[PDB]
Amino acid sequence: LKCNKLVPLFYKTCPAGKNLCYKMFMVSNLTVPVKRGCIDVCPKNSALVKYVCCNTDRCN
Amino acid sequence: LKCNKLVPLFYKTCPAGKNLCYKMFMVSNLTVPVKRGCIDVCPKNSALVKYVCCNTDRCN
Amino acid sequence: LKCNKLVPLFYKTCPAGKNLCYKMFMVSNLTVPVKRGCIDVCPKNSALVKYVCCNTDRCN
Amino acid sequence: LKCNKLVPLFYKTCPAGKNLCYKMFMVSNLTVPVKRGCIDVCPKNSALVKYVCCNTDRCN
Amino acid sequence: LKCNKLVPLFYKTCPAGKNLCYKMFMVSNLTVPVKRGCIDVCPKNSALVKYVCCNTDRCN
């Protein structure tokens, strides 16, 4: 699939067997992603690092 | 005045005369700007581009 | 709200229900609107035509 | 190779074709480039548009 | 006074003693200027070169 990069004007064709897009936020600000891309499985949230995943094309 | 860069987690301190921050969008995609910084006056919109401007610190 | 008309120097008070100003162009020639005015909601581009809107007095 | 893309704070790895990074400047300002990218061959300066190219990771 | 310049998205605060913005055209193409900026006195049109001058901000 196709997922946005950090500057979401740009996008990536996800490699084989990553069929999730994600956004990584830092807990300080849940409105400003510091990472975007493709992923296999949505990682769990940690104390300071939150993730949101999705599966449409460029959903992130 | 402080305004956000394109990667809006960073900022720059607007030089003198420039007391507005702006986002520039291609009208084909109003979700994500191609340009962020400071300006003196909010430029007028073209056929392909949209400018939004604001006066607060990091308002963009 | 006030929006400019086609001709430079002239403008009008938008009616009830129209809170954007806009500009319309033909793709043949993008420097010269063929509509300039008030409107309720920004049309989406269709064949041969480009629109752009704004929501400040005489922004168009 | 890796080049900055659009802004100094963002980057991509180049496709197969392209083995230079570029900065493009308007003559009005030879300090801040408007574009930055990967490219095959360094394009040619116009009177209005200057390019600088290089071949180290994020050299541009 | 502030006047538009030739390079796009560029402007100049007109120095002292220049209170006119202008545009210069070659007589063969009246749709693309070759000079745009600040001036003291509107030059007189010539055989090959034409001018128009104005004096509100960014009117050229």
Side-chain angles (χ1 to χ4, degrees):
Chain A
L1 97 150
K2 262 182 238 118
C3 296
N4 294 313
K5 320 230 271 275
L6 178 61
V7 187
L9 307 176
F10 312 105
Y11 62 78
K12 214 175 211 315
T13 336
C14 300
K18 317 207 203 155
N19 284 80
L20 276 181
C21 300
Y22 71 97
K23 292 195 273 161
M24 197 202 264
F25 297 107
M26 299 285 125
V27 62
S28 338
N29 199 335
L30 298 331
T31 57
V32 191
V34 298
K35 226 182 154 201
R36 288 194 222 233
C38 306
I39 199 104
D40 50 50
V41 36
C42 216
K44 346 230 75 169
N45 300 355
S46 82
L48 310 183
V49 182
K50 267 63 181 139
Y51 305 79
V52 167
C53 306
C54 57
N55 62 7
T56 39
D57 257 343
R58 304 181 100 222
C59 55
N60 65 339
Chain B
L1 180 61
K2 266 154 191 204
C3 297
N4 289 321
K5 298 201 208 188
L6 213 230
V7 182
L9 221 104
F10 297 79
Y11 74 79
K12 56 141 118 191
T13 167
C14 291
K18 309 264 203 78
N19 278 281
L20 290 176
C21 301
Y22 69 100
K23 288 175 256 137
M24 178 181 152
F25 299 99
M26 305 299 302
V27 175
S28 67
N29 194 0
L30 300 179
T31 305
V32 46
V34 288
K35 257 149 165 257
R36 281 176 158 123
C38 327
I39 26 101
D40 47 282
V41 188
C42 209
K44 217 112 220 212
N45 291 348
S46 337
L48 301 185
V49 342
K50 237 242 166 154
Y51 298 91
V52 176
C53 305
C54 49
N55 44 357
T56 289
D57 271 326
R58 305 178 98 198
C59 59
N60 61 331
Chain C
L1 154 84
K2 299 201 224 87
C3 306
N4 294 310
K5 300 161 92 164
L6 271 161
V7 175
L9 234 72
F10 307 83
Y11 59 76
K12 60 154 159 143
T13 272
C14 290
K18 326 219 205 166
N19 286 101
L20 294 155
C21 308
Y22 77 106
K23 227 140 65 207
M24 189 185 209
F25 299 87
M26 314 299 299
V27 295
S28 341
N29 158 228
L30 299 179
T31 92
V32 176
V34 305
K35 304 184 90 172
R36 211 157 167 245
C38 297
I39 198 149
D40 62 5
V41 52
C42 209
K44 25 186 163 207
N45 296 341
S46 53
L48 300 180
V49 124
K50 300 231 147 213
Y51 293 87
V52 71
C53 303
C54 59
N55 71 352
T56 276
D57 279 331
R58 300 177 73 184
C59 56
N60 66 328
Chain D
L1 177 68
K2 289 178 202 219
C3 302
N4 297 315
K5 234 262 164 197
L6 232 204
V7 284
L9 267 39
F10 180 63
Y11 73 79
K12 51 140 59 197
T13 70
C14 302
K18 313 182 198 185
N19 290 279
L20 291 166
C21 301
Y22 74 91
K23 314 188 263 161
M24 193 217 261
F25 309 86
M26 308 312 298
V27 263
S28 56
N29 180 347
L30 270 21
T31 292
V32 174
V34 273
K35 290 184 105 239
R36 331 167 90 109
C38 293
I39 199 139
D40 56 12
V41 202
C42 207
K44 296 322 174 99
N45 299 15
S46 104
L48 294 186
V49 157
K50 310 299 155 169
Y51 301 80
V52 172
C53 298
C54 57
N55 55 18
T56 19
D57 289 299
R58 319 174 73 188
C59 57
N60 60 329
Chain E
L1 145 107
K2 263 143 179 191
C3 293
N4 288 113
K5 266 286 203 174
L6 200 56
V7 158
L9 262 187
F10 174 45
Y11 65 108
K12 219 201 195 93
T13 294
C14 291
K18 298 180 170 168
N19 284 41
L20 253 26
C21 305
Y22 72 113
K23 260 219 246 247
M24 183 172 124
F25 296 117
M26 297 293 99
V27 60
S28 48
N29 195 347
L30 267 34
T31 63
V32 50
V34 295
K35 245 223 185 181
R36 193 177 183 201
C38 308
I39 204 133
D40 30 283
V41 189
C42 204
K44 231 85 199 103
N45 293 337
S46 130
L48 306 195
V49 182
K50 310 289 175 197
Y51 304 80
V52 278
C53 299
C54 62
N55 65 337
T56 48
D57 293 305
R58 290 175 208 279
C59 51
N60 61 338

